[PDB]
Structure 1
Amino acid sequence: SNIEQYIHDLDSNSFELDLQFSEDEKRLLLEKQAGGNPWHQFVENNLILKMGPVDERKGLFARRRQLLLTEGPHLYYVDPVNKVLKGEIPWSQELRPEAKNFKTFFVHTPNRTYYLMDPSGNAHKWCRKIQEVWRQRYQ
């Protein structure tokens, strides 16, 4: 199955998937997630395509999230300390990621632009992956 061929784990909490797997491979990837991923409970049984820590600039100080791009598509954000789903960035054809620098990226949606910061310096990886999924979904 060599299913690991599609998984690129940086560490416990950051990975992304190559999106060129078959339906049988998808189901195997999902069983692996349910069996092994501590954030699976937050994503409504959707296969996680990319996850990792991101800070949202909101209110009086940045909120550290675990951000999860999934099948759906969905972008869920979870409190990584108290282990509670905090919300989702709403997905539509109008959703648009935009890199501002190596650490900062925005996710534009009709009623709100989410201002996000990747402390690892890989905001572009987030934009690229969100765009890849957007392209697959919207042509």
Structure 2
Amino acid sequence: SNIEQYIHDLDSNSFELDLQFSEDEKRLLLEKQAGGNPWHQFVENNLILKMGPVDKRKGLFARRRQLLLTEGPHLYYVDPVNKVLKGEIPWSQELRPEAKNFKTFFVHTPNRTYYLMDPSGNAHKWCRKIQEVWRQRYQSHPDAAVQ
């Protein structure tokens, strides 16, 4: 049975995964990634749970990056022109995504807020997926009010 069911393609360089797959299914997802995803090389073999372009504010004009939310968890950002990892948004219990509007989201961390503009207008998809990963990482029982 086809791991395609967990995959939501948003455009040619952008998709997100439903996170309810089994370990065998993870295997097949990783297999498709390693065999066919040109960003695989940047993510330390981690399964990509969501990826897509963002414009990251810096200087006078934002810089286009491919953002990759992965197993680990990690948030990697890659320069698509020079084909080089530029950095990672550090994960911790204090990490918080925030959707400013349909096309702007922040990822707040202790020393830095990352100011990301989603050219596709899907900031809330980004925030929900990041927060879903956060919940699974930091909450023993994510559906409980408190832990």
- TM-score with structure 1 setting the length: 0.97
Task: Choose 1 or 2 for highest CA Rg.
Answer: 2
Superimposed CA distance per residue, residues 24-70 of structure 1 (whole angstroms, 9 cap, x where no aligned partner)? 11111001100000000000000000000001011221010000000
Deviation at 1:11, TM superposition (A): 2.5
Deviation at 1:9, TM superposition (A): 1.2
Identity of aligned residues (%): 99
Superimposed CA distance per residue, residues 9-29 of structure 1 (whole angstroms, 9 cap, x where no aligned partner)? 123210000000001111110
Take 1:125 and 1:10, find their aligned partners in 2: how far apart are those partners? 10
Tell me what 1:132 maps to. Answer: 132
Where in structure 1 do 4 or more consecutive aligned residues deviate above 3 Å? none
Q: Please, which moves more after superposition, 1-10 or 31-40?
A: 1-10
Q: Please, which moves more after superposition, 77-86 or 38-47?
A: 77-86
What is the aligned-residue RMSD (CA, Å)? 0.9
Tell me what 2:34 maps to. Answer: 34
DSSP-derived class of the 1:100 partner: strand
Take 2:40 and 2:2, find their aligned partners in 1: how far apart are those partners? 22
Structure 1 alignment gaps of length 5 or more? none
Tell me what 2:109 maps to. Answer: 109
Tell me what 2:79 maps to. Answer: 79
Take 1:42 and 1:12, find their aligned partners in 2: how far apart are those partners? 18
- TM-score with structure 2 setting the length: 0.92
Structure 2 alignment gaps of length 5 or more? 139-146
